[PDB]
């Protein structure tokens, strides 16, 4: 249905693993979108196709103001193209580099929009498994938008930086919707402290710290926050709350700026 000669390409937006994201314009409508270019050669030598076809299946069907739209796909000689909703205010990764750390207002607000989009995802039995500030894009009004559904899959189920992965996942063990709640705790901590609660210098140390759940809150972290992070960073996936509790938590309700 789509062809490259329908788009006026532009400036690069971010580098992926198997190709770059570029700013683009649909000639006939003047529509601004972001093109995610992937290379068949690269995806081949890794065996990601399935996941790339899964990413597209999952993302094309989901509709939420806190989830990035996938408007379609196409492919050339060696490139695979994904037509996405352009996020004009970049990523949460860049914003955290600038600000160093976020205030309770900003953090609660992001945690609220994150939980929101997650409920939707989980209600269709879809687990993201790759919730990272690198994959959390910002829309024109500063709204959070989950992106990159490469690692998403239908719940339950059996690579890169370990940080945002729950112990069940890093240990091959079977996993469900509760995986995304561990990520939610890791993100909250990182939003307030400026670093994830298990960061190390080696893949090796990170694994040990995650498996043991070895984390220590610095001075400036309030009780209200300390409580929710600890509530979400439980080794037992069933001992973790449901997004509903997260959304209604005193510290969230008190600090989140609603519409
Ligand atoms: N719609 C968009 N608008 C603005 N920037 C984007 C958009 N999509 C991606 N980017 C930028 O491009 C980079 C790549 O994003 P993405 O995570 O989709 O690629 P990826 O990590 O290779 O995906 P995958 O996890 O499937 O390999 C990100 O750092 C992001 O900042
Ligand atoms: O040329 C190919 O056979 C090829 C196609 C695709 C593809 C086609 C439509 C939608 C999507 Br999502 C992907 N992907 C490929 C790939 F990932 C590696 C090698 C070849 C292809
Ligand atoms: Mg990514």
Author numbering: 127 to 284, 290 to 390
Authors' own words:
Aurora A kinase (AURKA) is a member of a family of Ser/Thr kinases whose orthologues control progression through mitotic cell division. The localisation of AURKA to microtubules in the mitotic spindle is mediated through its interaction with a protein partner, TPX227. Besides localisation, the AURKA-TPX2 interaction modulates the catalytic activity of AURKA3738. Here, we report the identification of AurkinA, a drug-like inhibitor of AURKA, which binds to a pocket occupied by Y8 and Y10 of TPX2 in the AURKA-TPX2 complex (the Y-pocket).
To provide structural insight into how AurkinA binding might hinder formation of the AURKA-TPX2 complex, we determined the crystal structures of the AURKA catalytic domain in isolation or when liganded to AurkinA. We noted that whilst the structure for AA30, like that for AurkinA could be determined in complex with AURKA bound either to Mg2+-ATP or JNJ-7706621 in the active site, the AA29 compound could only be soaked into AURKA complexed with JNJ-7706621. Interestingly, depending on the concentration of reducing agent in buffer, the AURKA kinase domain crystallised either in space group P6122 or in P41212. In contrast, the binding of AurkinA, and indeed any of our compounds increased the overall B-factors of the crystal structures. Importantly, in all structures where a small molecule is bound in the Y-pocket, the electron density for the AURKA activation loop remained largely undefined. More detailed analysis of the liganded crystal structures revealed that binding of AurkinA and its analogues caused significant local alterations to AURKA structure, as well as changes at sites distant from the Y-pocket. Based on our structural data, we hypothesised that the allosteric, Y-pocket-binding inhibitors would not affect the Km for ATP, as no significant changes in residues involved in ATP binding directly were observed upon AurkinA binding and ATP was always present in the active site. The F165-F144 backbone hydrogen bond was significantly shortened (3.2 Å to 2.8 Å) and the K143-Q168 hydrogen bond present in the ‘active’ apo structure was broken in the presence of the Y-pocket binders, potentially impairing the ADP removal from the ATP-site.
